[PDB]
Scaffold this active site. Structure first.
Site, mmCIF file in Angstrom:
data_model
loop_
_atom_site.group_PDB
_atom_site.id
_atom_site.type_symbol
_atom_site.label_atom_id
_atom_site.label_comp_id
_atom_site.label_asym_id
_atom_site.label_seq_id
_atom_site.Cartn_x
_atom_site.Cartn_y
_atom_site.Cartn_z
ATOM 1 C CD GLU A 11 17.389 42.828 9.403
ATOM 2 O OE1 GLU A 11 17.674 42.013 10.384
ATOM 3 O OE2 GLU A 11 17.199 42.433 8.301
ATOM 4 C CG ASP A 20 21.358 35.661 10.972
ATOM 5 O OD1 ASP A 20 21.448 34.361 10.879
ATOM 6 O OD2 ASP A 20 21.811 36.475 10.176
ATOM 7 C CG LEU A 32 25.699 37.107 6.874
ATOM 8 C CD1 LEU A 32 25.207 36.310 8.103
ATOM 9 C CD2 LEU A 32 25.223 36.512 5.555
ATOM 10 C CG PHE A 104 18.746 44.898 4.211
ATOM 11 C CD1 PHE A 104 18.576 44.225 5.405
ATOM 12 C CD2 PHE A 104 19.672 45.938 4.200
ATOM 13 C CE1 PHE A 104 19.381 44.496 6.513
ATOM 14 C CE2 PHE A 104 20.473 46.236 5.303
ATOM 15 C CZ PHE A 104 20.332 45.512 6.479
ATOM 16 C CG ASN A 132 2.817 34.123 -5.096
ATOM 17 O OD1 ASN A 132 4.012 34.556 -5.210
ATOM 18 N ND2 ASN A 132 2.423 33.045 -5.688
#
Ligand SMILES: [Cl-]
Ligand SMILES: [Cl-]
Ligand SMILES: [Xe]
Ligand SMILES: [Xe]
Ligand SMILES: [Xe]
Length: 162
Positions: A11, A20, A32, A104, A132
């Site tokens: 991050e 972002d 955020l 997160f 997947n």
């Protein structure tokens, strides 16, 4: 390596409000602030989190705190998400971190939407489940990040981060 080291890598670190990849107001280490386009909302919100008039800017320490609270909540979320608890618990330690990064990043909810992989992941089908996971809006939007994570999950080592 660990959860904090890991997410610090994925991050980054910003002392000034930024948007972002999503266009959302954020700060620190992936904190955020608001989905709203209002930079003002966004400063209100920073101020509120921080406990003072930041004027859009925080210190390292401040980011480190939000970060601490953010990891904590994540784990606490997991552990209380009834779909999530049992996967998490079934995992070794590396893999747990991978589940927490994801959470997160996209929220208990979003994560809860990897049912299919989450179940193969539950069932120890490393590669099956990883393939997947790749078929996801999440993978296509942040491939490089997503990769480090489905790697760590699948392998159970930190190689993707070394
Ligand atoms: Cl907060
Ligand atoms: Cl990325
Ligand atoms: Xe997953
Ligand atoms: Xe995986
Ligand atoms: Xe996964």
């Amino acid at each position: 390596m660990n959860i904090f080291e890991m997410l610090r890598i994925d991050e980054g670190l910003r002392l000034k409000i930024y948007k972002d990849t999503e266009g959302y107001y954020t700060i620190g280490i992936g904190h955020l602030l608001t989905k709203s386009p209002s930079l003002n909302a966004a400063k209100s919100e920073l101020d509120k989190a921080i406990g003072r008039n930041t004027n859009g800017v925080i210190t390292k320490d401040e980011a480190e705190k939000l970060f601490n609270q953010d990891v904590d909540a994540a784990v606490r979320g997991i552990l209380r998400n009834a779909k999530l608890k049992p996967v998490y618990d079934s995992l070794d330690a590396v893999r747990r971190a991978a589940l927490i990064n994801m959470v997160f990043q996209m929220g208990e909810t979003g994560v809860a939407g990897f049912t299919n992989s989450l179940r193969m992941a539950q069932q120890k089908r490393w590669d099956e489940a990883a393939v997947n996971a790749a078929k996801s809006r999440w993978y296509n939007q942040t491939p490089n990040r997503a990769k480090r994570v489905i790697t760590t999950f699948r392998t159970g080592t930190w190689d993707a981060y070394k």
